[PDB]
Amino acid sequence: MKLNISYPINGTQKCIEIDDEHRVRVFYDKRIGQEVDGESVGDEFKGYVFKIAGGNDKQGFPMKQGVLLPTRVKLLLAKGHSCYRPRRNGERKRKSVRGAIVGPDLAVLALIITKKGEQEIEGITNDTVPKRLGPKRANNIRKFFGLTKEDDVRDYVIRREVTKGDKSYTKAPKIQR
Amino acid sequence: GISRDSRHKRAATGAKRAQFRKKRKFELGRQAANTKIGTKRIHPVRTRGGNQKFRALRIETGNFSWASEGVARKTRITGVVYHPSNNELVRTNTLTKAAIVQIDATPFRQWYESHYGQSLGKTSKNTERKWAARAAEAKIEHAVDSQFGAGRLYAAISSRPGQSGRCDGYILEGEELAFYLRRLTAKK
Amino acid sequence: ARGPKKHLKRLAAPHHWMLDKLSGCYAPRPSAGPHKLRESLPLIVFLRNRLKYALNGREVKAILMQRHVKVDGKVRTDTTFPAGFMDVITLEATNENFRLVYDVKGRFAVHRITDEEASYKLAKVKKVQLGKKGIPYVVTHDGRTIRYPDPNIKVNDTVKVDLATGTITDFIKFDTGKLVYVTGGRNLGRVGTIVHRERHEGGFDLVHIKDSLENTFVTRLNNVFVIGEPGRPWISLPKGKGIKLTISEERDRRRAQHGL
RNA sequence: UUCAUAAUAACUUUUCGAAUCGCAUGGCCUUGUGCUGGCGAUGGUUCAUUCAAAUUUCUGCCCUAUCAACUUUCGAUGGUAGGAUAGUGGCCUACCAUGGUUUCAACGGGUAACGGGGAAUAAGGGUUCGAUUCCGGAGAGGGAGCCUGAGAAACGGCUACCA
RNA sequence: GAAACUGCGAAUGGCUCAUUAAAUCAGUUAUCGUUUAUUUGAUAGUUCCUUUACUACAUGGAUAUCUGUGGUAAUUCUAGAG
Numbered sequence: 001m002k003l004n005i006s007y008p009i010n011g012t013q014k015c016i017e018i019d020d021e022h023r024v025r026v027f028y029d030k031r032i033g034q035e036v037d038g039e040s041v042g043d044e045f046k047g048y049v050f051k052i053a054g055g056n057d058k059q060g061f062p063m064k065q066g067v068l069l070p071t072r073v074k075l076l077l078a079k080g081h082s083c084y085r086p087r088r089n090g091e092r093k094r095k096s097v098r099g100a101i102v103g104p105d106l107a108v109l110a111l112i113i114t115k116k117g118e119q120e121i122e123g124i125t126n127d128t129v130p131k132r133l134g135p136k137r138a139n140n141i142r143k144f145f146g147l148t149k150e151d152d153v154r155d156y157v158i159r160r161e162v163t164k165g166d167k168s169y170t171k172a173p174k175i176q177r
Numbered sequence: 178g179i180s181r182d183s184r185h186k187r188a189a190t191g192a193k194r195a196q197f198r199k200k201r202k203f204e205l206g207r208q209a210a211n212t213k214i215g216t217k218r219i220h221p222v223r224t225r226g227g228n229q230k231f232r233a234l235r236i237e238t239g240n241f242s243w244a245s246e247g248v249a250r251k252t253r254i255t256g257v258v259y260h261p262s263n264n265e266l267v268r269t270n271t272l273t274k275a276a277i278v279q280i281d282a283t284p285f286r287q288w289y290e291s292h293y294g295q296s297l298g299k300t301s302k303n304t305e306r307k308w309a310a311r312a313a314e315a316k317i318e319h320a321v322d323s324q325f326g327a328g329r330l331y332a333a334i335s336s337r338p339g340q341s342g343r344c345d346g347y348i349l350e351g352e353e354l355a356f357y358l359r360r361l362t363a364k365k
Numbered sequence: 366a367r368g369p370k371k372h373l374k375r376l377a378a379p380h381h382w383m384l385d386k387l388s389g390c391y392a393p394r395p396s397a398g399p400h401k402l403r404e405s406l407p408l409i410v411f412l413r414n415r416l417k418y419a420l421n422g423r424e425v426k427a428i429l430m431q432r433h434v435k436v437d438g439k440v441r442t443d444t445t446f447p448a449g450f451m452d453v454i455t456l457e458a459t460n461e462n463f464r465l466v467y468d469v470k471g472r473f474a475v476h477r478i479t480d481e482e483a484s485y486k487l488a489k490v491k492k493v494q495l496g497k498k499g500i501p502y503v504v505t506h507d508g509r510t511i512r513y514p515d516p517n518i519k520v521n522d523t524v525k526v527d528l529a530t531g532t533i534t535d536f537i538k539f540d541t542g543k544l545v546y547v548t549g550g551r552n553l554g555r556v557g558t559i560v561h562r563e564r565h566e567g568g569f570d571l572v573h574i575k576d577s578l579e580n581t582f583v584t585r586l587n588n589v590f591v592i593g594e595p596g597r598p599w600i601s602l603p604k605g606k607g608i609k610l611t612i613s614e615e616r617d618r619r620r621a622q623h624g625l
Numbered sequence: 626u627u628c629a630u631a632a633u634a635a636c637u638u639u640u641c642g643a644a645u646c647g648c649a650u651g652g653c654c655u656u657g658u659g660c661u662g663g664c665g666a667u668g669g670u671u672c673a674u675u676c677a678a679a680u681u682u683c684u685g686c687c688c689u690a691u692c693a694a695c696u697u698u699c700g701a702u703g704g705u706a707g708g709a710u711a712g713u714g715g716c717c718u719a720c721c722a723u724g725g726u727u728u729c730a731a732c733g734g735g736u737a738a739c740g741g742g743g744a745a746u747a748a749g750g751g752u753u754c755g756a757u758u759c760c761g762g763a764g765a766g767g768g769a770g771c772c773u774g775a776g777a778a779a780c781g782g783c784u785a786c787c788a
Numbered sequence: 789g790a791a792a793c794u795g796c797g798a799a800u801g802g803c804u805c806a807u808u809a810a811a812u813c814a815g816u817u818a819u820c821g822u823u824u825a826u827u828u829g830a831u832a833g834u835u836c837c838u839u840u841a842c843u844a845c846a847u848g849g850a851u852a853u854c855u856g857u858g859g860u861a862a863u864u865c866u867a868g869a870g
């Protein structure tokens with residue numbers, strides 16, 4: 001089934017389709033938050049290791065963390081919980097949700113890749129996706145720079161330049177606090 | 178869901194009032210606190226108009242006051258010995274208002290010792306002159322000395338742990354104690 | 366109703382706003398403020414209807430927003446502000462000043478009143494209490510809480526707020542033989558002198574009032590507002606001074622004072 | 626009035642006591658980013674006031690006795706203490722007392738009954754109507770349960786059963 | 789100036805008369821028996837705790853929006869990553 005792999009440090013991710021019945025066999029009976037070695041999931045996944053963080057059932061129902069069940073269940077979700085977003089304040093809703101134990105009923109497995117392996121993936125182990133915007137708060141910018149705080153963090157704010165086609169103009173965030 | 182409205186009650190005459198205006202939210206009643214002893218665990222409940230209320234189940238220590246010389250001290254509640262409403266709470270050690278409890282009684286003891294120093298149960302010149310000016314007025318009655326020798330004070334709680342969250346009360350003293358000890362001797 | 370009510374249908378509006386029963390389904394509900402909505406007067410009613418300076422709601426909104434209205438020395442940019450009895454409405458444009466006093470028919474009449482006296486306001490004392498840390502304070506009918514009042518100022522009394530600093534300037538003590546105004550019931554707008562104040566142990570004080578024309582009536586003490594000493598009112602009384610001429614006398618006034 | 630308020634002793638899984646925005650950015654010279662400094666906007670504890678909300682006293686309701694006794698073990702009337710309540714209150718619990726209404730019609734039954742301001746009718750007295758332009762109450766298919774808030778037992782908010 | 793977070797209203801208004809015969813309601817009282825966003829008027833030095841060593845010229849981390857990967861036949865369904 002579909003596997004959504006995401007490498008955080010490179011900030012990259014990809015989707016992988018697997019049809020073999022035995023590569024996914026190790027994913028069976030493994031709950032969210034566990035670690036599975038990449039040797040048993042693919043001969044091109046040597047050295048890799050996979051944290052399992054969420055997924056989607058064949059019916060589209062995602063799996064909630066901490067359900068410890070290989071089946072679906074109807075739960076009364078509210079604000080703070082995942083698998084649900086409230087429209088009105090305090091709007092509890094009873095919705096179906098897949099359990100946290102991975103079984104054959106899953107359709108997508110969301111997988112963090114934790115340890116860099118031997119054979120590099122195409123654009124995940126190799127490429128890096130830049131962060132779309134930097135820090136905004138003054139001390140946050142200082143920490144991101146290691147700026148020896150009494151150093152006039154005013155100027156060191158990042159500045160993104162965009163060209164309208166005729167005029168090149170700068171846009172930089174306003175510093176809070 | 179526990180209502181406290183008067184509609185469900187029969188009329189003064191005795192007629193069975195027909196159902197009308199399904200019960201509201203400004204008529205609600207919540208579960209009893211039925212507090213216990215030990216491992217302080219107070220749960221806030223958001224009541225009408227904010228005004229955080231505090232359920233005080235499992236409460237072990239609280240403030241207690243002495244009326245004669247009028248001094249208050251934090252001290253431990255050690256079990257309940259009598260309840261004027263239901264002895265079932267006494268057997269279950271459920272602590273509500275007006276219940277009668279026992280007190281570790283030490284803080285009162287060395288407060289007395291540093292205040293009068295009469296050595297119950299059996300220095301700087303300023304303190305000596307204070308004691309001399311006192312001139313042994315601490316002629317506090319005999320039964321309180323009796324349970325001071327015993328070590329556990331007899332107190333009646335006055336705060337409402339169900340609402341306030343505190344565990345405050347006052348020691349039995351004077352004819353108060355008298356009355357209740359008779360009742361206790363009735364239990365004995 | 367579950368909660369507060371925020372709509373005032375036109376027929377349910379007080380008959381002293383005396384709007385047109387047609388040309389509208391609703392009426393301006395006064396927002397919360399210094400006066401009871403049954404007793405108060407919204408600014409939109411005072412401008413659109415009483416003064417006709419505006420024409421409709423948008424015009425009143427534009428008038429209030431640009432800070433030309435000043436209620437008791439403050440701007441009050443909200444459309445339905447409850448400008449109540451004895452409040453002062455200042456318009457720097459046309460440099461005009463109004464004080465809301467009932468005309469004897471019992472209505473919030475347009476009273477054009479001078480700038481010099483417009484600096485201050487009068488108020489009835491509704492409570493005298495002791496707030497925290499032992500500070501005495503006085504609550505007037507506007508809801509103004511004046512701190513540190515004169516020690517012998519009592520309830521039902523009257524006082525003269527300077528309306529600039531908002532402190533105590535002078536006061537008049539409630540007692541017999543004193544010029545007085547009426548602020549409710551059948552005797553709206555009437556002005557007289559207190560002849561007697563029967564105590565009525567247990568509640569609802571009553572006072573007897575005799576006006577200049579030597580007519581006599583009786584009114585509840587909650588309904589009473591001392592306004593000064595006989596012959597020397599502390600404010601500028603409206604035209605007619607609230608004598609309550611009889612309907613036949615009003616007809617005779619129409620017949621006599623008549624020129625076309 | 627045990628009221629307002631003040632005071633002492635203590636208590637708190639210690640609430641609040643501005644790390645928030647706009648405009649104008651003046652004055653002092655300690656001539657520096659230095660010292661101060663106006664008009665507002667949002668907040669914020671408490672006490673008032675207002676919009677209110679809950680209860681609450683007296684009196685007033687259509688037909689019917691082919692409805693004369695009704696209510697209490699399961700609260701019926703009262704007492705006390707506690708719990709809950711925002712708060713009084715059998716509102717609920719524990720233990721007691723055996724009480725409360727009734728021929729001045731209680732209780733039960735019926736209402737093709739929402740109550741009222743009012744409408745028709747008109748010598749005077751009245752008879753009938755009032756679902757609906759205003760004020761109240763209740764309801765969102767019938768039932769129960771609840772989060773959020775100051776305010777809902779909300780339903781153009783949710784939970785469950787029944788249809 | 790979209791979007792989203794925040795704040796506020798969504799409990800007003802509108803409709804219907806099904807239930808309800810001391811029930812609602814009307815007139816008249818009471819709250820010294822209580823909650824009250826808002827509006828309006830006032831309202832606080834002590835947050836130090838042994839003060840002879842602290843950020844007050846400003847303390848911390850998430851988090852939506854967004855960038856990208858999906859799932860379901862579909863619903864104001866949203867899980868993973870930055």
Ligand SMILES: [Mg+2]
Binds near residue numbers: 366
């Ligand atoms: Mg309505």
Ligand SMILES: [Mg+2]
């Ligand atoms: Mg007091």
Ligand SMILES: [Mg+2]
């Ligand atoms: Mg009681």
Ligand SMILES: [Mg+2]
């Ligand atoms: Mg009917």
Ligand SMILES: [Mg+2]
Binds near residue numbers: 755
């Ligand atoms: Mg009707």
Ligand SMILES: [Mg+2]
Binds near residue numbers: 755
């Ligand atoms: Mg009718």
Ligand SMILES: [Mg+2]
Binds near residue numbers: 756
């Ligand atoms: Mg009908």
Ligand SMILES: [Mg+2]
């Ligand atoms: Mg209506």
Ligand SMILES: [Mg+2]
């Ligand atoms: Mg409803």
Ligand SMILES: [Mg+2]
Binds near residue numbers: 766
């Ligand atoms: Mg229908």
Ligand SMILES: [Mg+2]
Binds near residue numbers: 774
């Ligand atoms: Mg709100």
Ligand SMILES: [Mg+2]
Binds near residue numbers: 780
């Ligand atoms: Mg409902």
Ligand SMILES: [Mg+2]
Binds near residue numbers: 781
């Ligand atoms: Mg609808």
Ligand SMILES: [Mg+2]
């Ligand atoms: Mg609705």
Ligand SMILES: [Mg+2]
Binds near residue numbers: 088091782783
């Ligand atoms: Mg909803």
Ligand SMILES: [Mg+2]
Binds near residue numbers: 809
């Ligand atoms: Mg009946």
